[PDB]
Amino acid sequence: VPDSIDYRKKGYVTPVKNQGQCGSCWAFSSAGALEGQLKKKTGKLLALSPQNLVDCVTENYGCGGGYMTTAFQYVQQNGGIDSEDAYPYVGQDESCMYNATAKAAKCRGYREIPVGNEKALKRAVARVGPISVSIDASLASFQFYSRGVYYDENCDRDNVNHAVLVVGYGTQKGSKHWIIKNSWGESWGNKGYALLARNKNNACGITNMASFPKM
Amino acid sequence: VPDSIDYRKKGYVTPVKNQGQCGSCWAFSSAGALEGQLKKKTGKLLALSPQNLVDCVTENYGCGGGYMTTAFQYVQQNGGIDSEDAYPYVGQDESCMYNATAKAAKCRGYREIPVGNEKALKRAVARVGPISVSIDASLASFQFYSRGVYYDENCDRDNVNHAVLVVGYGTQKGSKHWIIKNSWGESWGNKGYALLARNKNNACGITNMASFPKM
Numbered sequence A, B: 001v002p003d004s005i006d007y008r009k010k011g012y013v014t015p016v017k018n019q020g021q022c023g024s025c026w027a028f029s030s031a032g033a034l035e036g037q038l039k040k041k042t043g044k045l046l047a048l049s050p051q052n053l054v055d056c057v058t059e060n061y062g063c064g065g066g067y068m069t070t071a072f073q074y075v076q077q078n079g080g081i082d083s084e085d086a087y088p089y090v091g092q093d094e095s096c097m098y099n100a101t102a103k104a105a106k107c108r109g110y111r112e113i114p115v116g117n118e119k120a121l122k123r124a125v126a127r128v129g130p131i132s133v134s135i136d137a138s139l140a141s142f143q144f145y146s147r148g149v150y151y152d153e154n155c156d157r158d159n160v161n162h163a164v165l166v167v168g169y170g171t172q173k174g175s176k177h178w179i180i181k182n183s184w185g186e187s188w189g190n191k192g193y194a195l196l197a198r199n200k201n202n203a204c205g206i207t208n209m210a211s212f213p214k215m
Ligand SMILES: *[C@@H]1O[C@H](CO)[C@@H](O)[C@H](O)[C@H]1NC(C)=O
Pocket: A086, A099, A100, A101, A102
């Protein structure tokens, strides 16, 4: 297990998008994990559709929230998920318009990472790929993030409310970190990405909901 | 295990091509198997490049012959294979021009089917997908094939010289068969396909070299 990894450099990460006024953060995270795994299994980087998840995952809340595990389960039981080109993101709720002919990726279940265990998360990122996680984004310090390794002892490490995609880890000037891909556009953070305090005892609760799809 | 299957109907089979004046039959077979498996793993049907195999598999003979297993091993160790669009078929030998950025499929080893065991071949086709095989095509009866279930007791069930892709099995008017995809264009056989005598004691030696890739 490497001391550093950046899946952005391995071509596992799709360009940063903006979820707009819609709680589809879980959709982008799930789509990102499935994209990374699709890349790992095929070698082809292909933008999958979070909108498909928003509309067709009937056990999530569409633009009102949801989980990544439920999305993976959806992709598995439905027998596929559409590409971004075939099923574009519009940022609002609508009926399920899944085109099975536009099928571009499949799933075979999911795996959850043991709560509180950042070691298992690092091992996962190392051996699996971009891991779908969820953190506490409510703090203005996160809203105003722009550079460095993010940390705040006020950050809730127990209650969690925002899905992002861990695309690697490393260290910047002594401070260990998680590289996270957010869905608030390139106008937020470091062009859509952020560095999060690693090994600071589950900072922002990055291990409360860490999951990844199988292919 | 079904009594019949047609992967052409499941959208696992790429349109029939013509290998021209080049012994790249093994390339089309391997590419076909990898295409079927790529479809099974992703749900996307994508034409892979036999030319890539012809040029880059250095343990085969290019347009002079080769094995499918060696091709699978190539795709595995090289870490990918190009699409047909990126690496078109030209029907002649040339240098390896593999574009790793054009990577569209990967492999993780291969499996050979026990020689003489058509049962294991049927089970394979059922549980895996289109199986790369090789048969005896030398007979004029095969060259002039057009309809029915092909059979000839003069067909060599021991010595084998032509790679095709078993894309399913079934029965036509009492006679059990293997659906095979050849690479002699749509101007041969049933628009490029043929039905081969099944359970006629390894007819044309269809189990002498039956193999499939893993993904
Ligand atoms: C479904 O999606 C495919 C994606 O390639 C598209 O080509 C086709 O026009 C669509 N057809 C239907 C059934 O709406």
